[PDB]
Design a protein around this ligand. Structure first.
Ligand SMILES: Nc1ncccc1[N+](=O)[O-]
Lengths: 204, 215
């Protein structure tokens, strides 16, 4: 049974929304719980100058101290990360404890991850080559890709269902043929063509 | 101003778009409207899916229901976005491109996809873009819709290489010091160090970006 703790300054964003079949426990934590000042400050100007802000190490350090254990896998979504793939989702789906640290894309002070890595496994990962303001949406994607793999190539080609004719377009007759070896071969070719057209990187 | 309509059988799930988020609505730069696909059903049990022709696992969303929905929501100026693992890649360039659009409609699908005729039909009157946000599988297009909205909206007027490590105060923490060059005020040496750190991180984490083989 899996535990997922998410830490964010936008807890409402990650409020689950009604799969509660008691398979996984997901807890969301407001990062401001661990701030030190009356202003509940979570970021500060970057050393070396430049735009935006960097999230404070003292605040994140306290949060992870309380939430993480030696058994924890710490997930840090960031555009500067290793790629998050289906292989990753599969690996993480058998973990007991995931902690996802959501930060603004300018980043969390690197000493946070570096320190955590001396006591637990840390994975900095990117869900894609685009920039988001913060890690929250990436966290939703990771949570969904991982949890759907918990009990309870080529591209896929087009799919079809009833009715057999709709707005002048017929379902490919082969799909209604009852020749299942031929259907497989047809689907294989559709996958080849679609992969060539949309994702030539997948063919080498 | 921009208009985004999202069509889904899980409307409440597109609540994370709301107030305390970059998803901008409050500043009146975009209006985001979420529609329950089941609004366009007519049968008692509000059915939106059916078993696939030709066999296979799962269900396929019916064309009839999606057709009526898109008839009501789209115009010929609409950019129809269909998140799918079989889509063209959604990239930063895509985000910049869509940031200048007047009207995005995002069709969120579940099970094993939407009957292909829906996208084919729509393309006879509007521009259609089937896209993938990444090489992982989600149950449905909803989370991908949130990602796309976040990536696009932060580029709207009025709102290469990997970024290396960043630091802020204090300059020493748990016996770990900020790199001294970052404290030196030498803009040229700081730029050089950051450039270097970025290329070290890219070669390690994303060698593909520099034209090398992936692990
Ligand atoms: N692409 C991203 N942008 C911001 C935060 C996280 C991200 N990611 O890909 O995991």
């Amino acid at each position: 049974s899996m535990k997922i703790d998410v830490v964010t300054i936008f807890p409402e964003y990650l409020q689950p929304v009604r799969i509660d079949a008691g398979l996984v426990d997901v807890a969301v934590h407001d990062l401001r719980r661990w701030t030190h000042d009356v202003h509940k400050s979570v970021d500060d100007s970057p050393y070396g100058g430049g735009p935006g802000m960097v999230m404070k190490p003292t605040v994140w350090g306290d949060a992870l101290d309380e939430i993480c254990t030696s058994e924890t896998l710490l997930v840090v979504p960031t555009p500067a990360g290793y790629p998050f793939t289906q292989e990753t989702a599969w690996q993480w789906s058998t973990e007991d404890h995931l902690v996802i640290a959501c930060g603004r894309y300018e980043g969390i002070d690197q000493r946070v991850a570096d320190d955590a890595a001396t006591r637990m496994r840390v994975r900095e990962v990117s869900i894609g080559d685009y920039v988001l303001n913060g890690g929250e949406a990436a966290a939703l994607v990771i949570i969904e890709a991982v949890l759907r793999l918990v009990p309870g190539s080529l591209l896929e080609g087009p799919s079809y269902t009833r009715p057999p004719s709709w707005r002048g377009m017929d379902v490919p007759p082969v799909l209604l043929s009852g020749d299942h070896a031929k259907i497989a071969a047809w689907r294989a070719e559709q996958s080849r063509q679609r992969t060539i057209e949309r994702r030539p990187d997948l063919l080498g």
